[PDB]
Task: structure prediction
Amino acid sequence: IQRRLIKSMESVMVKYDATVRNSINQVVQLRYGEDGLAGESVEFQNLATLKPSNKAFEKKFRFDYTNERALRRTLQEDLVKDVLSNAHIQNELEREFERMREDREVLRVIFPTGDSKVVLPCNLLRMIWNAQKIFHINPRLPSDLHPIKVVEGVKELSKKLVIVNGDDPLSRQAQENATLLFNIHLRSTLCSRRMAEEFRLS
Amino acid sequence: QSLETRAEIQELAMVPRMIVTPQSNRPVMGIVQDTLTAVRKFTKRDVFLERGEVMNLLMFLSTWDGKVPQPAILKPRPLWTGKQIFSLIIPGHINCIRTHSTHPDDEDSGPYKHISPGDTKVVVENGELIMGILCKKSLGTSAGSLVHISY
Amino acid sequence: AGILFEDIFDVKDIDPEGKKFDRVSRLHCESESFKMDLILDVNIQIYPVDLGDKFRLVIASTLYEDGTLDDGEYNPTDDRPSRADQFEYVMYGKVYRIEGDETSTEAATRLSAYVSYGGLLMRLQGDANNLHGFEVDSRVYLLMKKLA
Amino acid sequence: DDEEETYRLWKIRKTIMQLCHDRGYLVTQDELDQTLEEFKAQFGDKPSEGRPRRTDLTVLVAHNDDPTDQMFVFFPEEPKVGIKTIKVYCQRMQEENITRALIVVQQGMTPSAKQSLVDMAPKYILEQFLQQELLINITEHELVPEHVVMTKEEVTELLARYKLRENQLPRIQAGDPVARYFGIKRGQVVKIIRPSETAGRYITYRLVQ
Amino acid sequence: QANQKRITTPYMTKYERARVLGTRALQIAMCAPVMVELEGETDPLLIAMKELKARKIPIIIRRYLPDGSYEDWGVDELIISD
Amino acid sequence: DNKKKIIITEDGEFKALQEWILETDGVSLMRVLSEKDVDPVRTTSNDIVEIFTVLGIEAVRKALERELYHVISFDGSYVNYRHLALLCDTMTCRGHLMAIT
Result:
């Protein structure tokens, strides 16, 4: 069986256009493993927005910019004033939650069984823990991180993580698809609320 | 038999480059028989090392900065713990949570979650073994272990 | 001074869950001056502790009587006046957790500082007033002495 | 014996309407989701005696893009359809000026009728379907991903993006159940969208053969 | 192929690093001039690994695409990770 | 739970309904799917040939992934999904079931 599998697959290889092809140059996969990632950097993680109820999801991921106390406990004092006064920031956070909800539906459709265990490149919780310990984050003090900075930074990051290169619409559908699960994990992990009351990064 | 092939093997096939396998995104080599039984016995809560024993063990650390750590117990005797020396073995500033194989399943719910009576619930934090007994689950070939996280 | 906490504890129980380790024992103690619970792992082989014992516990950031930081390195050839001279059982560890009864809007009335002395674990929990000196990832000393 | 038959005959119509809708033909929502009880009301509930006869089940739809591009669905009465019936249907299709058809046979169809369906392809493209494989819509199975017939402009897109020739795409046989469902012919490319556990979504493209 | 685009990755692959280092080590062993400074290194591979770290290896990688075209990348233009 | 009916409650939680399922010693997927009160959406088979004949090349690609994953993981083992995916793509990229022979 081993020999048969080798002789059947031996010449399949990742090409410089990032497709997987055989000796004949026929396309076996447009991206390796459907995501264009190697198997020895990925690792087990949990999708935080898959299993929770609507109501737990709402409570854990929707940034509450109405509770003035609570923001006072989580954020610094100019941060609190900006979050409470500005309505552009509030609507940025509102549609942040709106795609975490759309992403939740997409995950639900992808994982019809409620299994949040997934294999993804970057262990975001471990990286957040590393950042907490590297910069000596005090979980008990209010943070100096603006939630709008979280939203903006997470989108610039998402734009920078490229599996499929190209500005044409086909290359953007393929790029959206290749990093869809990782971008969902990233938006649900680097959420403004989680980074404000769970992680307290600066 | 050539510098070409020597560089090829040095940059592709060397054992440290081979620690994590693409087959199952996890280490392919881990800590094995005597070292694993002994690290289980070493990271138990009641392992106390004397000054001379600690120096003898520090002779065998290649990645030692030459600074003897402050013992966990200073009086009536200076005593280092096995976790305190494994903390010196642990590289970098890695962070890791595991559970010893004897970890009771009903301990994570009740009190004493973060202060384990049985010294299960491995916690490595800034490269120091804060607590827990190391075993196959922490130093073996499974995913998320200390060797994997180190790699 | 460099003292984060000082109080007098009374050993109320030893190994409620049973003896887990031979040379290490877990004391569940409660003080009288501050009404603080204490779980403490102690090497009973070198410093035996009996039920009903009463001791003074001093969590300190440093051993030197004058305010002076420590390097975390073992210096046995140190001649300055150390407060470990005043005590029998001394351990050196780090705070790895601070829990509390805080809510999303209210601060903590009760805190719970967790320390690790090379794997010997301690939990000092009680009013948040008495646990302001504790940060996580901060090195402290035990300074425990038996009294009659 | 008879309730059986009208139930079958109603599913076959339901699957055919779903198929025509997926192929892009004008199908009203009412007939898209027609309950068994209206099927009985509109056609009857005793097919055995002749109410409904399968000749009354004939469907005629029109493409959304082109009202002149219509398509027929015929339900022959004989279990084994002979050429000579094909020849009738094709005559009808001529004098209604229609060019595409489905024949939902019950038991099968004769080799001579098979060969007639094949030889006269450039004139009318009329397909075969069994009873048995229209009682279910296979595109609703969990194993079947989302298939989408690409247009030539899209295929030219695709080959220009990935800079490849049609023989380098993965293939799908022209007789494949889903290819037959979508009525796709050799040289067309079908875009398959499926969920992937590593990427979330994955689009592959299969060339018809 | 337009050099103003290059569609391939801006990172040097592990295989590119391996072959570039081996090739440059063989060139150094055959008395090619060294591009970086040398303290006491006499092993060709170590000299090649300095030349790579300094990004001073005079080699162009011609990456072939499946369609038949190619892209030329200087070793200094690629991102060395390891 | 792998064979229970996993639904999403109105509250948004995953619930596993405990429902009757039938396991046959034979296989006529063509016929069984077209039976009253039989689920034509989840009803499947382990015979990949008849999955190909009935549902098609992408269906048998998925089902073949599923069966290989069942073989691999039955002993608790785990293999990265990209390897199974590559095998199953080699096995189905030409529009028919290509045996590894």
Notes: Residues 87-110 of chain A form the longest helix (24 residues). The longest strand of chain A covers residues 43-46. Strands of chain A lie at 13-14, 20-21, 27-29, 43-46, 117-120. Chain A has ten helices and five strands.
